[PDB]
Amino acid sequence: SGFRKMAFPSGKVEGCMVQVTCGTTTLNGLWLDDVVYCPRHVICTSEDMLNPNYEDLLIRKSNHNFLVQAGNVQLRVIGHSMQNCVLKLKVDTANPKTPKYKFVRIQPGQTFSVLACYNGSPSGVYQCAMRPNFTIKGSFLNGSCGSVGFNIDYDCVSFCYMHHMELPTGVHAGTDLEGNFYGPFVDRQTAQAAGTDTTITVNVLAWLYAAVINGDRWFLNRFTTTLNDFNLVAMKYNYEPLTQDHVDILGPLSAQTGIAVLDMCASLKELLQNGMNGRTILGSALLEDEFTPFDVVRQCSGVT
Amino acid sequence: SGFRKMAFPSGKVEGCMVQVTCGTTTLNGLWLDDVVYCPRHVICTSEDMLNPNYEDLLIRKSNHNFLVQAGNVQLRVIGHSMQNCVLKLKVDTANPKTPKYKFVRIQPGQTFSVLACYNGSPSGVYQCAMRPNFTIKGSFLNGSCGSVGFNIDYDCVSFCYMHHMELPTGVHAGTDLEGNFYGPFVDRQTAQAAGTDTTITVNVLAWLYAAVINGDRWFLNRFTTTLNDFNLVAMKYNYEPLTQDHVDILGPLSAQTGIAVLDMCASLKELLQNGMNGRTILGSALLEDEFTPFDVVRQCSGVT
Ligand SMILES: NC(=O)c1ccc(NC(=O)[C@@H]2CCCO2)cc1
Ligand SMILES: NC(=O)c1ccc(NC(=O)[C@@H]2CCCO2)cc1
């Protein structure tokens, strides 16, 4: 028992992390097969970042200008291309530690593990969510760019995020491994304000299921609601509208606990309207929305 | 910027995890050099756990009764001994992936990463603290025993915890890698109630420093306090007494932020007495005590 914000084991991704240096900019690269993926802003000075023309900056760069180091060993760059906001650096050596992997573009509300890296060296691992405003709330200092977000299905790492920038509000924006930003963000140092950080309702409900499973049940009430009634309250509290898709996704947790999804909705409605009254749920004084139904099932059943 | 509950990268420890089976009991072992460490209760049936005589149960066990599997490969057990509450299984093969390592017995309030494992396969990594009552609040299902807690200093894994049992209250108890339980807990299925789960005051202050560093400053006030005055409030709120040792430990964060430790104490005193009033600090509605001053410095400076 017990319920923890749990990252995937990072070993498979540790084995992929390299240092990429272009001129005076050092950040992290992901080495899969004979390709190193990194943010294209590796080619920018701090000055460049104000109004970068990446195609033009990239013309002034050759294979030998990209310094790629895996541990203490230099990789030879035999090609480089720009795909959207990432650079793909072709190297002469396939990463021998390349895991089974996929590139996946995740939806808002989906969770993933970040391996925070500096100079291609892992510093730590934490779990986060693609926010509904397509930011993430990460922990990223200078040099952390090219750190990646991932999920693991048994032995297959699905890479879903590469870190690119911090908004002036200290939230984070990045790309999938095809170099496409999540949301409207650009790799330029400009006014980019995030939209409403709404709460991932389906994830809160999942976490309320996890709480019941793990003995935290004080918030279960005598009430039910409908999707429409619940959603009137959700809207009021900047919670994402709950869909029948979400209800269907919560079906297994509903089944396990014997609490109908709409009853858990009615409990969540009372928690929104009444607050927690100084009480906690799974050691949190606020409603946690960075567990997916899949995360709750995985953690509650012990998938490896 | 941003501040996350961050585990150490787990790769070095993933490479140490094995499955140990004795009869019908399967749990996890830690393979370092030619020794596999596992909870001695691997030799117990569920029946045995009510009143186990480990020396007597162990007599009925031979090397060939301990089934040790690293991935899909069986290890040959050439010796077995009991050290306190762990078994040391000597195997004929040194773990080729043995990292630099130490066994350390941590103090209450100290944080570490847990690699939750089932059948010797990692399921996830999370950060936790040795509580002042020598429990941990983990996430451990049946089969998770022998999962380990660790810190990393660059390339040296300090193993500080091996998971052994869940108290009837769903908190966790375990040993160091010498098999000595943290606190008064025993590997027997009995009435074992945890003491007062007091808040790790020095860790809260560290996390308040992290909050200021990362822009969350609404709780800074116009007041200061003394250690004695603060401690009267601490006692009232089941917070650990703050010592001059703790003040000295917070010195670097004090220096970085220019907020005197006793001023941060006075801010923490007001937060205890006045609550958060529906406000959050680093996305928490309660005072987080599972970051050490070292964790805050490490994460705020980007140590790898
Ligand atoms: N304003 C934009 O250019 C914009 C681009 C992409 C998205 N969608 C996403 O990032 C993820 C990807 C899967 C669907 O949701 C939203 C807005
Ligand atoms: N009642 C007991 O037998 C007991 C045993 C050990 C401890 N101390 C610890 O577990 C850690 C280890 C470093 C100091 O604090 C406390 C009580």
UniProtKB/Swiss-Prot annotation, chains A, B:
Cross-link (Glycyl lysine isopeptide (Lys-Gly) (interchain with G-Cter in ubiquitin)): K5, K90
Limits of the Peptidase C30 domain: 1-304
Cytoplasmic side: 1-304
Coiled coil: none
Regulation of protein activity: Inhibited by pyridone-containing alpha-ketoamides compounds 13a and 13b. In turn, alpha-ketoamide 13b (tert-butyl (1-((S)-1-(((S)-4-(benzylamino)-3,4-dioxo-1-((S)-2-oxopyrrolidin-3-yl)butan-2-yl)amino)-3-cyclopropyl-1-oxopropan-2-yl)-2-oxo-1,2-dihydropyridin-3-yl)carbamate) inhibits SARS-CoV-2 replication in human lung cells. Inhibited ex vivo by michael acceptor inhibitor N3. Inhibited ex vivo by compound 11a and 11b.
Catalytic activity: TSAVLQ-|-SGFRK-NH2 and SGVTFQ-|-GKFKK the two peptides corresponding to the two self-cleavage sites of the SARS 3C-like proteinase are the two most reactive peptide substrates. The enzyme exhibits a strong preference for substrates containing Gln at P1 position and Leu at P2 position
Effect of K90R: In strain: Beta/B.1.351
Effect noted on mutating C145A: Complete loss of 3C-like proteinase nsp5 cleavage
Effect of M49A: Does not affect ability to cleave and inactivate human TRMT1
Active site, per annotation: H41 (for 3cl-pro activity), C145 (nucleophile)
Compartments, record wording: Host cytoplasm; Host Golgi apparatus; Host nucleus
Physiological role: Cleaves the C-terminus of replicase polyprotein at 11 sites. Recognizes substrates containing the core sequence [ILMVF]-Q-|-[SGACN]. Cleaves and inactivates human TRMT1, preventing tRNA guanine(26)-dimethylation of tRNAs. May cleave human NLRP1 in lung epithelial cells, thereby activating the NLRP1 inflammasome pathway. May cleave human GSDMD, triggering alternative GSDME-mediated epithelial cell death upon activation of the NLRP1 inflammasome, which may enhance the release interleukins 1B, 6, 16 and 18. Also able to bind an ADP-ribose-1''-phosphate (ADRP).
UniProt subunit comment: 3CL-PRO exists as monomer and homodimer. Only the homodimer shows catalytic activity. Interacts with host FBXO22; this interaction promotes the proteasomal degradation of nsp5.
UniProt-recorded name of the protein: 3C-like proteinase nsp5
Originating species: Severe acute respiratory syndrome coronavirus 2
Upper lineage: Viruses, Riboviria, Orthornavirae, Pisuviricota, Pisoniviricetes
Gene: rep
